[PDB]
Design a binder for this molecule. Structure first.
Ligand code: ATP
Ligand code: THR
Ligand code: MG
Length: 489
């Protein structure tokens, strides 16, 4: 149907006996989740929540968080998720920037808006007016690199267009088990949640436990019988180490879907020798929050493991696209350019960032294009290959540097897991190439990199970290690495 509410309604009306949520040994049926959610919506209505309103959600992953989010959607409102490892100042900003009429869960400088507590939500375990396709389902905040975190509001019709685009490339059924691996404040959780709840499938909630190892994660994945696993490449590399080390088998896995980072063939090779490429399928998906979770699809093949190219494949069925030169021109085959995207999954622009919206969402004088700020090429055969972020193609003292190439060159060192390379302003006068990396001292690393890279591309300073700092989506927080570096210097 038109909305996420419709999707849940259909599946719940039609498969009420099936398990919607699985939290350790706890199982909630679609039927009972549906009941709980209708009740929560009525409760939200009573507290003065209206269609088009925005409600904060702040809860650990579990039954209550999910039921609250359905209740919020059923009430015609958008949920604005706050991840609880988010620093208090970040919530405080989002709470005010998004102007929520209420918060669900427990809390922040001002509490003066109304609360629905977790205990309140647990208690409820024709209705308010239903939302339309053009109503906002969620508002997820992305990283603003200097300037503030920015909010992206995604509509019901945006999300429902996502699952329609994917209907024929994936083979999903009510029998699947989806893992909720990701933060509810990361849009990859939307795919995970609604992947399950739109089809009658089961959603396995990874309960919140920070001392859980990859090894434990692997063990749950086998034991809870997961068929659809979503991972960032960073997460999957560590998962693979654990699966291979303990020798875990995963015969029930049907799909592993990658998103959110550049997926290198090297990351995938160890997996592929153990399980092959036929089961599960490996699917790389390029995506951005501004165009609703995923924008492309590429099933991995043996060929992708021969070269070192990052194939992201073709735009999802809903999309039209451009590959654009610095000049505004359409790029030739094999030529790198900026990817632009148009279609029903593209968001309506940022929240309260009117000038940024103006720049990155454009209409000719024609489709409405979102400028991804990502560099890609169309290879012969029509597949997209991902090159890198225009952000990270920088210039320094007369040379152009692919920061991402330096990074990979540092990663080429066998004892190095991860690297972040950037231009650091030591002073206005002194701008130099810097690297942070995780496990080899700087001396050995520096000596190795002098092999791989031209001299202008060699990091001027190396900082060894126990781990790289992480935003809640599990990516390396670049602004956090630069600040840690600066303070250690
Ligand atoms: N399959 C992929 N291969 C390569 N890069 C990817 C892939 N999927 C996502 N990315 C990168 O991740 C980004 C999408 O991230 P998201 O929408 O969460 O915001 P962000 O890039 O983390 O920050 P912002 O929204 O502030 O630009 C894209 O800019 C792209 O560079
Ligand atoms: C799933 C992944 O592509 C997510 N939308 C991100 O933008 O980081
Ligand atoms: Mg981006």
């Amino acid at each position: 149907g038109a909305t996420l509410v419709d999707l849940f309604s259909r599946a719940a009306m039609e498969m009420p006996d099936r398990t919607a949520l699985h939290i350790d040994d706890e199982k909630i049926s679609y039927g009972l989740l549906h009941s709980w959610a209708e009740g929560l919506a009525d409760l939200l209505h009573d507290a003065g929540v209206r269609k088009g309103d925005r409600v904060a959600l702040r809860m650990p992953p579990g039954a209550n968080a999910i039921a609250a989010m359905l209740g919020i959607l059923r009430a015609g409102a958008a949920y604005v998720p706050l991840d609880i490892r988010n620093p208090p100042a970040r919530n405080a900003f989002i709470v005010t920037d998004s102007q929520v009429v209420a918060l669900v869960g427990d809390p922040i400088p001002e509490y003066t808006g109304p609360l629905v507590t977790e205990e309140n939500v647990a208690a409820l375990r024709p209705g308010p007016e239903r939302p339309g396709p053009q109503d906002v389902a969620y508002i997820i905040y992305t990283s603003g690199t200097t300037g503030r975190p920015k909010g992206v509001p995604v509509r019901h019709g945006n999300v429902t267009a996502l699952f329609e685009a994917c209907s024929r490339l994936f083979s999903f059924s009510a029998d699947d088990r989806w893992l909720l691996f990701h933060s509810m404040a990361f849009d990859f959780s939307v795919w995970e949640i609604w992947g399950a709840l739109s089809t009658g499938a089961e959603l396995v909630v990874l309960p919140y436990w920070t001392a859980r190892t990859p090894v434990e994660t692997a063990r749950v994945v086998r034991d809870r019988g997961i068929t659809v696993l979503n991972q960032t490449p960073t997460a999957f590399g560590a998962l693979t180490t654990a699966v291979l080390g303990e020798g875990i088998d995963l015969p029930e896995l049907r799909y592993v879907v990658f998103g959110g980072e550049k997926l290198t063939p090297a990351v995938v090779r160890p997996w592929a020798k153990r399980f092959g490429l036929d089961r599960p399928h490996l699917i790389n998906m390029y995506g951005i929050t501004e165009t609703t979770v995923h924008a492309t699809f590429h099933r991995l093949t043996e060929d992708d493991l021969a070269a070192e190219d990052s194939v992201i494949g073709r735009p999802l069925p809903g999309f039209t696209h451009r590959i654009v030169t610095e000049d505004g021109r359409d790029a030739a085959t094999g030529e790198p350019g900026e990817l632009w995207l148009a279609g029903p999954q593209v968001s309506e622009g940022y929240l309260n960032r009117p000038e940024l919206t103006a720049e990155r969402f454009t209409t000719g004088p024609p489709p409405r294009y979102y400028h991804s700020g990502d560099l890609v090429s169309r290879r012969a055969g029509g597949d997209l290959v991902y090159q890198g972020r225009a952000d990270l193609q920088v210039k320094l003292r007369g040379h152009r540097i692919e920061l991402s190439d330096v990074e990979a060159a540092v990663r080429t060192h066998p004892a190095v897991v991860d690297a972040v390379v950037w231009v650091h302003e030591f002073a206005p006068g002194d701008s130099r190439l810097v690297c942070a990396y995780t496990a080899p001292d700087a001396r050995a690393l520096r000596a190795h990199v002098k092999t791989v890279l031209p001299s202008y591309m060699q990091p001027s300073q190396y900082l060894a970290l126990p781990e790289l700092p992480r935003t809640i989506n599990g990516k390396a927080d670049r602004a956090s690495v630069a600040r840690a570096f600066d303070e250690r210097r």
